[PDB]
Design an enzyme around this catalytic site. Structure first.
Site, PDB file in Angstrom:
ATOM      1  N   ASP A 111      11.486   6.323  -4.705  1.00 37.47           N
ATOM      2  CA  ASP A 111      10.394   7.204  -5.119  1.00 37.47           C
ATOM      3  C   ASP A 111      11.046   8.340  -6.168  1.00 37.47           C
ATOM      4  OD1 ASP A 111       8.093   8.743  -5.271  1.00 37.47           O
ATOM      5  OD2 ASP A 111       8.168   9.352  -2.909  1.00 37.47           O
ATOM      6  N   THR A 112      10.641   7.973  -7.366  1.00 38.67           N
ATOM      7  CA  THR A 112      11.133   8.884  -8.279  1.00 38.67           C
ATOM      8  C   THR A 112      10.178  10.467  -8.326  1.00 38.67           C
ATOM      9  OG1 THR A 112       9.435   7.731 -10.022  1.00 38.67           O
ATOM     10  CG2 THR A 112      11.483   7.237  -9.798  1.00 38.67           C
ATOM     11  N   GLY A 113       9.306  10.396  -7.718  1.00 34.60           N
ATOM     12  CA  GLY A 113       8.368  11.650  -7.427  1.00 34.60           C
ATOM     13  C   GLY A 113       9.037  12.490  -6.520  1.00 34.60           C
TER      14      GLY A 113
HETATM   15  C1  LIG Z   1       7.873  14.653  -1.908  1.00 30.13           C
HETATM   16  C2  LIG Z   1       6.594  14.036  -2.131  1.00 30.13           C
HETATM   17  O1  LIG Z   1       5.955  14.221  -1.142  1.00 30.13           O
HETATM   18  N1  LIG Z   1       6.474  13.085  -3.100  1.00 30.13           N
HETATM   19  C3  LIG Z   1       4.881  12.579  -3.475  1.00 30.13           C
HETATM   20  C4  LIG Z   1       4.813  13.014  -4.694  1.00 30.13           C
HETATM   21  C5  LIG Z   1       4.550  14.381  -5.226  1.00 30.13           C
HETATM   22  C6  LIG Z   1       4.064  15.313  -4.120  1.00 30.13           C
HETATM   23  C7  LIG Z   1       3.508  16.721  -4.506  1.00 30.13           C
HETATM   24  C8  LIG Z   1       4.650  17.379  -5.406  1.00 30.13           C
HETATM   25  C9  LIG Z   1       5.310  16.479  -6.418  1.00 30.13           C
HETATM   26  C10 LIG Z   1       5.636  15.127  -6.186  1.00 30.13           C
HETATM   27  C11 LIG Z   1       5.253  11.293  -3.257  1.00 30.13           C
HETATM   28  O2  LIG Z   1       5.873  10.506  -4.153  1.00 30.13           O
HETATM   29  C12 LIG Z   1       5.807  10.613  -1.987  1.00 30.13           C
HETATM   30  C13 LIG Z   1       4.904   9.441  -1.262  1.00 30.13           C
HETATM   31  C14 LIG Z   1       3.435   9.810  -1.729  1.00 30.13           C
HETATM   32  O3  LIG Z   1       2.961  10.867  -1.219  1.00 30.13           O
HETATM   33  N2  LIG Z   1       2.824   8.929  -1.968  1.00 30.13           N
HETATM   34  C15 LIG Z   1       1.185   8.627  -1.815  1.00 30.13           C
HETATM   35  C16 LIG Z   1       0.473   9.669  -3.016  1.00 30.13           C
HETATM   36  C17 LIG Z   1      -0.239   8.748  -4.018  1.00 30.13           C
HETATM   37  C18 LIG Z   1      -1.694   8.127  -3.323  1.00 30.13           C
HETATM   38  N3  LIG Z   1      -2.515   9.190  -2.870  1.00 30.13           N
HETATM   39  O4  LIG Z   1      -1.702   6.908  -3.633  1.00 30.13           O
HETATM   40  C19 LIG Z   1       0.722   7.427  -1.510  1.00 30.13           C
HETATM   41  O5  LIG Z   1       1.329   6.370  -2.158  1.00 30.13           O
HETATM   42  N4  LIG Z   1      -0.396   7.442  -0.739  1.00 30.13           N
HETATM   43  C20 LIG Z   1      -0.859   6.020  -0.237  1.00 30.13           C
HETATM   44  C21 LIG Z   1      -0.354   5.499   1.082  1.00 30.13           C
HETATM   45  C22 LIG Z   1       1.235   5.021   0.889  1.00 30.13           C
HETATM   46  C23 LIG Z   1       2.102   5.376   1.961  1.00 30.13           C
HETATM   47  N5  LIG Z   1       2.893   4.468   2.496  1.00 30.13           N
HETATM   48  C24 LIG Z   1       2.438   3.908   3.771  1.00 30.13           C
HETATM   49  N6  LIG Z   1       1.854   4.421   4.695  1.00 30.13           N
HETATM   50  N7  LIG Z   1       2.942   2.570   4.114  1.00 30.13           N
HETATM   51  C25 LIG Z   1      -2.261   6.279  -0.121  1.00 30.13           C
HETATM   52  N8  LIG Z   1      -3.127   5.224  -0.482  1.00 30.13           N
HETATM   53  O6  LIG Z   1      -2.786   7.412   0.181  1.00 30.13           O
HETATM   54  C26 LIG Z   1       5.029   9.041   0.239  1.00 30.13           C
HETATM   55  C27 LIG Z   1       4.903  10.352   1.111  1.00 30.13           C
HETATM   56  C28 LIG Z   1       4.720   7.739   0.394  1.00 30.13           C
END
Ligand SMILES: CC(=O)N[C@@H](CC1CCCCC1)[C@@H](O)C[C@H](C(=O)N[C@@H](CCC(N)=O)C(=O)N[C@@H](CCCNC(=N)N)C(N)=O)C(C)C
Lengths: 99, 99
Positions: A25-27
């Site tokens: 995860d680059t974020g």
């Molecule tokens: C550290 C952290 O928090 N850093 C975040 C990025 C960001 C957060 C706010 C401050 C700057 C950095 C993400 O880099 C991390 C990542 C995340 O938050 N990504 C979400 C958001 C994008 C989106 N809304 O799509 C995501 O991918 N959400 C999917 C569910 C996939 C999760 N996977 C499974 N449950 N298997 C969804 N469709 O909701 C993790 C928690 C999986």
């Protein structure tokens, strides 16, 4: 390796003898892992995600292997939906983004 | 180009005639930009991260120009702390993870 993003970059990590799947995860500044117990003393930390803040448990000098690359570093343990390998360990294994 | 993870991978994007700054996030399924005024129709969706679940306004087939490359995709507008370029658009401009 070269990884494309048509699908989630899940990878296999070995942490203290156990095998788990983690997302590159680059974020993420840091590395956050699902609940578990590590070989040491922990300190409190607050991290910020998209849905809000979470309190995690900071452990330092933890040795973890990521796709054959061993890393040693800070690992945060808390209520994360998935194991996240953040930039702190990504920089260590030589990871970069390219287009 | 090749981007290093020593710092947050921030890039400048142009969406709706506006110039924004956004995080290249390989952990994000989608692209979610902070609350902004964008023309068009939309249907709500819900997503989650480390903090929990947020309600976002979904917009489809939107043109975004990321570091010189134009791209079409769905954009989510909501209470995100930082503007995020998810895997949905990172794939479009040919971005890969290398190590
Ligand atoms: C550290 C952290 O928090 N850093 C975040 C990025 C960001 C957060 C706010 C401050 C700057 C950095 C993400 O880099 C991390 C990542 C995340 O938050 N990504 C979400 C958001 C994008 C989106 N809304 O799509 C995501 O991918 N959400 C999917 C569910 C996939 C999760 N996977 C499974 N449950 N298997 C969804 N469709 O909701 C993790 C928690 C999986």
């Amino acid at each position: 390796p070269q990884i494309t993003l048509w699908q989630r970059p899940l990878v296999t990590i070995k942490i203290g003898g156990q095998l788990k799947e983690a997302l590159l995860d680059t974020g993420a500044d840091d590395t956050v892992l699902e609940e578990m117990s590590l070989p040491g003393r922990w300190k409190p930390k607050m991290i910020h995600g998209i849905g809000g803040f979470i309190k995690v448990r900071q452990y330092d000098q933890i040795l973890i292997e990521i796709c054959g690359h061993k890393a040693i570093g800070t690992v945060l343990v808390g209520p994360t939906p998935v194991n996240i390998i953040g930039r702190n360990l990504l920089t260590q294994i030589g990871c970069t983004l390219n287009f």
